[PDB]
Symmetry: C2
Subunit: 38 residues, 2 copies
């Protein structure tokens, strides 16, 4: 549905995808982003 602003990969193109009422993110985005923000 929505592409990752970071991964830009399709919702199903990634092995793990989390769907939200308006936000879509995969595991690499949070894994890489969580490490930076944390």
């Amino acid at each position: 549905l929505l592409y990752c602003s970071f991964c830009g990969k399709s919702q199903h193109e990634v092995r793990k995808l989390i769907a939200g009422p308006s936000v879509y993110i995969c595991d690499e985005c949070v894994d890489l982003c969580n490490d930076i923000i944390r």
Copy 2:
């Protein structure tokens, strides 16, 4: 800027917020979502 589809909290309302070209998510969303998807 954009509210979390899950947290619905403002971009600055959360202590940790990751900004993306079109996706905004905080630590609780990925922490709780990552545990479920993983």
